[PDB]
């Protein structure tokens, strides 16, 4: 049943907890991982499960879909998106101190109600 790319358990067993959890298979390379291990959340988990998810490196800056200066390519926290700090609507200069949120996150933030 595959294994996650961080503890290498499976879609029904974590190696770091010993708890059942469905892995996420990258759509760019095909490697599996526990969203929890992926540092994700449930929204991210679901997101990857509903669309073409990428495992960090496979994660290209959707904004310009290049992933050039990836060393800036921020990491989303609700879906699994990736945006170059210098591509964002309000381009980042330095990795936000708190929990950064991609645009999908924001549009989802509003879409939550109304």
């Amino acid at each position: 049943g595959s294994y996650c790319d961080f503890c290498l358990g499976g879609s029904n067993m974590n190696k770091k907890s010993g708890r059942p959890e469905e892995l996420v298979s990258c759509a760019d390379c095909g490697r599996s991982g526990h969203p929890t291990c992926l540092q994700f959340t449930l929204n991210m988990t679901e997101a990857v499960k509903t669309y073409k998810w990428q495992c960090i490196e496979c994660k290209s800056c959707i904004l310009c879909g290049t992933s050039e200066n990836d060393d800036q390519l921020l990491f989303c926290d609700d879906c699994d998106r990736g945006y170059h700090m210098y591509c964002l609507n309000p381009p980042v200069a330095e990795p936000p101190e708190g929990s950064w949120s991609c645009h999908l996150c924001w549009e989802l933030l509003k879409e939550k109600a109304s």
């Binding site: 290498l8 991982g33 980042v92």
Partner: peptide
Amino acid sequence: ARTKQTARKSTGGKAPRKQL
């Protein structure tokens, strides 16, 4: 703000090299 660089990218792990 997990950025895609050395200092971070802890979600870029893909099974440790142990299976030869």
